[PDB]
Structure 1
Amino acid sequence: MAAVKTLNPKAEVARAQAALAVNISAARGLQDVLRTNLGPKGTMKMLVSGAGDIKLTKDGNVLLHEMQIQHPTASLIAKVATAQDDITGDGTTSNVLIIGELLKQA
């Protein structure tokens, strides 16, 4: 359909409003997952790895790394939150929530 798909037959392309919709949907999904982390009244999440290790956490960055997500926009937001954690050590959940709400309002 698109030019790229014409040049590369097995190429996945999201163009025009499709790309914006995909990015906004991914951001909203991440925000929906991470809503419950905010505040001292938040809820513990239990994360089980492939080997079966059990991890209890409410940290936004820790939750993001252990989320079973393979989305591009999710990867971008995860990298931003990783930098946030690396430099300041706090605000990862707030980072994700603010990004998602910014995208939704836009």
Structure 2
Amino acid sequence: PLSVFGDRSTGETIRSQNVMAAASIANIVKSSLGPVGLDKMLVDDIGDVTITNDGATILKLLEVEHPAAKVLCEL
């Protein structure tokens, strides 16, 4: 019918997908909050290590695909 060259998600499916992406981004850095938080080791598949606790740095280094997760990273 539409004959559009691509995928389409409508209704609760896309909303659940967006919420899943946002929740995954939140759970990435939830463990580094508060004084009892702990840092993270980040390796860029070349041998460079970035030990960091900053949420902005963690979200910047990671390569992300979903648009909502990208929205949270830019936030």
What TM-score bracket applies, with the shorter chain setting the length? Answer: 0.7 to 0.9
Letter in 2 for 1:60: G
Give the TM-score taking structure 2 as reference length.
Answer: 0.87
Unaligned runs of 5+ in 1: 81-106
Q: 1:69 aligns with which of 58, 64, 70?
A: 64
SS at match of 2:51: strand
How many residues were matched structurally?
Answer: 75
Unaligned runs of 5+ in 2: none
Runs of 4+ in 1 over 4 A off after TM superposition: none
Matched, 1:7 2:3: yes
Identity %: 27
Give the TM-score taking structure 1 as reference length.
Answer: 0.64
Deviation of 1:51 (Å): 2.1
User: Could you tell me how far apart the structure 1 residues matched to 2:44 and 2:18 are?
Assistant: 27
User: Could you tell me how far apart the structure 2 residues matched to 1:30 and 1:61 are?
Assistant: 12
User: Could you tell me how far apart the structure 2 residues matched to 1:14 and 1:65 are?
Assistant: 28
Matched, 1:43 2:12: no
